[PDB]
Design a protein around this nucleic acid. Sequence first.
DNA 1: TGAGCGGCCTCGGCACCATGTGACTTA
DNA 2: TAAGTCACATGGTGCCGAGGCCGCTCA
Lengths: 241, 84, 50, 108, 118, 108, 123, 241
Amino acid sequence: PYTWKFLGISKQLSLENGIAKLNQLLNLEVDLDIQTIRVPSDPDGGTAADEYIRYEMRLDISNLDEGTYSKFIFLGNSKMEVPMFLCYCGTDNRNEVVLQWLKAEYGVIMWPIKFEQKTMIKLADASIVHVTKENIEQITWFSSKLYFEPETQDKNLRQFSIEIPRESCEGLALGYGNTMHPYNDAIVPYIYNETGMAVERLPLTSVILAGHTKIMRESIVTSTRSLRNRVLAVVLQSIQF
Amino acid sequence: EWKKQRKDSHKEVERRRRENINTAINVLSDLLPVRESSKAAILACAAEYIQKLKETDEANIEKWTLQKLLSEQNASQLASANEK
Amino acid sequence: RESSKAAILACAAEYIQKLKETDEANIEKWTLQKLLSEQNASQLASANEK
Amino acid sequence: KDVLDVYIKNLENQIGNKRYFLKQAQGAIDEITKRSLDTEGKPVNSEVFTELLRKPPIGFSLTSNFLSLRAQSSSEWLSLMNDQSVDQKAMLLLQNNINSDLKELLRK
Amino acid sequence: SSEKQWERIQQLEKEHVEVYRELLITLDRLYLIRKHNHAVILSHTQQRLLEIRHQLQINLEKTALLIRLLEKPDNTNVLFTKLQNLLEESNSLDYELLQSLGAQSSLHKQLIESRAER
Amino acid sequence: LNDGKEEPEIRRLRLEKNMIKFKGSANGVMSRYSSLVPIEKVGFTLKNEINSRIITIKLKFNGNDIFGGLHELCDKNLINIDKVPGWLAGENGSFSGTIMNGDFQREQ
Amino acid sequence: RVERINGLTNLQKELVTKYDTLPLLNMNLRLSYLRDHTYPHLQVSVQSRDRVHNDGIEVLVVNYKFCRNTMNPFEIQFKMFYKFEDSTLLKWEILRISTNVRLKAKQLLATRNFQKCLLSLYE
Amino acid sequence: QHQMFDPGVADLLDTDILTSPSKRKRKLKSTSDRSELEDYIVLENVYRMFGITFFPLVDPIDLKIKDASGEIFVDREMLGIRLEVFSERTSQFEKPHYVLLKKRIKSNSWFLFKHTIPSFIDVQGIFDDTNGGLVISHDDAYLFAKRVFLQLVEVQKRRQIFKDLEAKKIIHDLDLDLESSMVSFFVKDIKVELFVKQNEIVSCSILDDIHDFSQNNKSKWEIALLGSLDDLELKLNHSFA
DNA sequence: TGAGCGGCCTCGGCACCATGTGACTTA
DNA sequence: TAAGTCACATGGTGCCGAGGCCGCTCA
């Protein structure tokens, strides 16, 4: 239950320099981690300019809950119109101090990120593909639940959900064929063919993967302590102009 | 942390176990004649269906023995009528 | 009897499917035997009709 | 309402006649285009266009549609222009205030 | 059901004026091509006069059976009342257009002088 | 899925098509989305057989009038009215059940 | 595309423009159903539907030929008086009965409600 | 003559549409076909005078294309029947009751899809009783239709007899339930309430008690009043005098 | 100005699935 | 020691009757 709030950044800011100023301001050492991930390793997802820069800023004091574990995750690519976004979990009041310092030090323009319906479908696609230490990608199947809150006159239809079990989801994926985006290619077309609902047009408020994560229109909350690389990448292509 | 990573791994193992239990329950409900919703209702209907299939098998065995007796009687009687 | 509940439910599903298959096989075999007996009875009944 | 229905029938009859005349005209012009292998357009003679210039319920339809959507477009033009104008008044009030502020800052 | 009749006759008259305008254009270009062989590359100064003769034919027809219906006031046909409704909504907003244009032009002059001062 | 200011006569016809699909009558049984009986909660469990695999979809609904709201969503081009099934359209209303082999059997 | 369909519309053209639950308007198909499926072996025939439009009353004469026994089928001929609006059967009379069913039909047709009479004759 | 077109362009323009409306009508799409459709409608009304008719029906969901050239074929064939009972008292046809049968996808047999018949007539039980469950041929469908049309005839005839009893002023104000089975009426002031089965009175109850009225004569009247409905009308008019 | 019905709405009690962790077993 | 099965205790979504204030609302 770690909600991730997403904010975009107008500039490619380099964090390996100047973080000592943040350490002096906050009177505590942060555990900045540098990684260079290549998310679209699939040939159909692109084979060039796939490298990202992943920063994991962490206000490390103690490890009991998110009151002392408000992580910060930054992702960046210099070959894009918008070059950087951040996402941070927890509810500590030092996080907005970190954001204010980031603004006042790098001169960046920061705005909250809202996901569209197709963006949420692509994020649900991204959050099942897991990278393994043997450098392979594994699709872990979760019993999804598309959850809608339509606005109709006289509040005729307040809300309606579409629950899809795990074995039915993998059966739909195997029926479509060998694909790496199951929801956008197999689940959503099956829903459209059966019930007539275009879920990329309907007001979709959340899709819930049971036991793993439940992404919303403005936040992503995950049972897992971190956020995988595919979700970060899909958020990064989401905010492009 | 090391212990936090162990807790996360055990959490994932328990989640996989629960998903396997739910998948097995859904498969058993798919094999059920009448469609149920709750887990307890699914298990009770599965027990009732297994007992019903056992009774159906025993009744079919008895029915086949009675049918064989009827066929033997009909054949012997028709042969006797032919001789007469 | 199994230990894990998943194996118990999987064996229950397999037992239900096996019971259905055995019932169908018994019905088919008894149908074939009854067809043979009915053919013999019908031919001897036609002889009795003549 | 019977007079409205028969006038609707009369106008759809006229519409169908005009659609027929369009269909025959476009068939003729397409046949002449097919029979003319010259892709490049010939320069139009002025004397031919002169002779064209000497030669030749519709208007009720014309004035009704014209006046109706003319009034509608004028009304919505008032709506958009008045919103833009009150935006201009607000922007000019703010701009005059900050103009006085910059003038005072220049003097100081 | 009268509002349905007015809506219906509205799209019928829209399609009527559309088909008549394009019919007139196709007829005149058909005359141009049939008098010539393939002369279809006529200049802007000639296409504009074609548009002018179209426009004067249109408003001449409008005035022509404007003569036919408004000469003797029957005050019973509903098309007559439709003409007065259309006219009274057409001529109502004429002054406010020029008033708003002049006011917003004075606003634009204020923008110009404020920009020069800044 | 591919697709603005469509003709007001054929727009009336597709509105009539949605009205016919969700209420049975062209003019309805008589705002205008209100059905004959408002339904609060329905839950449908659609099951299919895609290459020897039973694929279940559990659709649950909530509101003051389920099928009126679905009719409004169909009017806003969010749900395809040519692909909305019978049970979603209000057939066997206020009954929640499982759709197997295209036949709706209610729950108990 | 807006299409107008009537009683003589093609079946394929009707299935092109079918989005309602109303019965099919293909009247040849409707009469094929009515002749072959619900009432087979019945040669119905209508020969005079003249009207008295001053009274608004339609005079119909039909011949029912129950041809299930093709060697000696029995046929009847009715005469109905419609009301043509606010539909009331003011009067119906039996014009002609075949003589081989004339007694049983004479006992049956003495009672009113000719719908029962037609269904009873067919049955 | 209103020569609308120029003589230079009237040669290639077909002006004959305005003179001949038949040319326009044959360039869009008669009176003999209208005559044959007219006779077809009259013949369909003649067939519907029987009461039990079959009409063709297509469910719009079951419309699919074969994709060979675009032939729309119905997937699951439907069959709808209508039951028009003739109300002799009003000399009118009552509003039809429609029963719609759809083919099972896996067994090729009709099933009770929809019906507009009230719940005091067990149409599902009648349909399951017809041919021991499954029905295939049109004969079984007509048998089920006749079996339920007899119930419609029974309720309409019972209501007709009681309404005619009211119309002849033989009895005072009465109350009818939906199938006209549980009734109560006053002959002079005696509240005679009846439970009547199909065209035969099986139970009777004389309720109102007068000081001159006795109980053994009441029981004798209750036994005598049993029997057919026409017999009840005759004997009630006999005992009224 | 004053009583007054109706959508809202939150309290909270109940119902049920969902969930994370220690204890314990298996390899 | 990595992984698995287990009941267990808490988390949480949905639901609904009670009741309160609000929100005009109308005389």
